[PDB]
Automatic annotation (TrEMBL):
A single BP term in Gene Ontology: carbohydrate metabolic process
Domain Beta-hexosaminidase bacterial type N-terminal: 1-134
An example Gene Ontology CC term for this record: membrane
Protein name: beta-N-acetylhexosaminidase
GO molecular function: beta-N-acetylhexosaminidase activity
Catalytic EC class: hydrolase
Family: Belongs to the glycosyl hydrolase 20 family.
PANTHER family: BETA-HEXOSAMINIDASE, BETA-N-ACETYLHEXOSAMINIDASE
Amino acid sequence: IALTPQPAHLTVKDGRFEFGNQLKAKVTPYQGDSIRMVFESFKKELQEATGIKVSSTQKEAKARIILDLNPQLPAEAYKLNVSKKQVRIEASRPAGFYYALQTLKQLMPRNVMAGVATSDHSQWSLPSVEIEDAPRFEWRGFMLDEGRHFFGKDEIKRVIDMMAIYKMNRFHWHLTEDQGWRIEIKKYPKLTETGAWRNSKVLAYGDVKPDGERYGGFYTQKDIKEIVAYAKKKFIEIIPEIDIPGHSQAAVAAYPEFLACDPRDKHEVWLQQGISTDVINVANPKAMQFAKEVIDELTELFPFNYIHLGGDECPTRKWQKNDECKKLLSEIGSSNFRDLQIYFYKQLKDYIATKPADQQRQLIFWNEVLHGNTSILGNDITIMAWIGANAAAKQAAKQGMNTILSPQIPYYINRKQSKLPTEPMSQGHGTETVEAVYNYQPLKDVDAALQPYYKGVQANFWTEWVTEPSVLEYLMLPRLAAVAEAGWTPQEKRNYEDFKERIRKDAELYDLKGWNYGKHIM
Ligand SMILES: CC(=O)N[C@@H]1[C@@H](O)[C@H](O)[C@@H](COS(=O)(=O)O)O[C@H]1O
């Protein structure tokens, strides 16, 4: 038995459940048939991998598989009880059933989770077990940067597939950057017409120069909707990030006349890595209108109730030199230009609050926003803590803000996972091994009183250096599974050597899916 993430409670019992060629299942009709829909999708996956067919019964006595509603269980929790006679699953919500069925598949040979038939197995069974399971953290995330390099819909579906294996539930889509803007906005076509294309594939840094090759791409709104729907089937919600008002050089290049602090200078999509001073003019009324209208479009495309507005690495230099910005700073009664960033967010937060309930969104920010007078903005925000993350998360929690931990080290899984010279180019020097990732303890030394604010964990994947899907996958796996387990499994049940033995069994899964992965611990 090799389950990842490790469930909260597992007892191995006597004997095995034998599937046979077909069997009857009883599935609760409640919750507007949503649980039957989860089960129908599982039936497809089971048949693909094993050829087993499942029929429906109302009779518990005839049911070899039963899915029952238990309202007492948390939203992502389940019980999975396998005996010789019956598989019994209990959960309170569709996601719980989905995760129970993920665990069920993981109890079978790896091809079942892979969704691929092989010649190896003839008869299918499950070990008898009693499992009660629920995630430690409600937010178990992966972020992909497509601003730096663009991967496109097929690869994002693969990413979602990888996340779902390990019960991750939040995909953070970093779609906008200095070096590219990757989402069609109908009201602002130049964001893609200008911002989605640039004259270099590689991004310059240090002595590395731009390459003069035309490079880019973007998602249509139709593509966005398809991906959102795909992720929903695997109980992954998508949080879009429009990183503003820093990391916005592509947008400024598209609409300099009102977004630039210095509109008489040239503005182009950045062909370099690093930190740009070409930030949005937060004091220009048309810039405010632009941000509102972008948020409006996001609300149409992304149903999840959170939006990420970024706020990392936003130099104030260009604001200090802008008369609109200087006028606004005095008007808001501050002498710190950082407060223009916070005031900008406050205006957007207020705008969102004007909308009907279903269109309202909670806001997430990178932790640098804590350096402003956040009383301007209030504490009903979420802080994604990435730089000095432990300290930043604690500061957020002390202020009553929710926090998500995405520490640069070791949860930036674009970073090298080995010191071997033959590793592909990415950030870091090979210290972010699977072991290092797994050994991070999100709540170490966090006061009991602050722990409720810690909503979970996220691995982030920045693509300055990473251009090819094979390399993305190589760097993602298997470290993604370590973060997934950190998000799911209670700390007291986490053990690196145990994880290593279990994750080794997934090499077969990756091979069957044609996913690349780091081989260092395999
Ligand atoms: C929020 C955030 O991370 N902001 C930036 C990202 O745009 C950048 O891509 C990432 C690279 O990290 S690295 O791979 O560890 O050098 O580091 C930070 O400087």
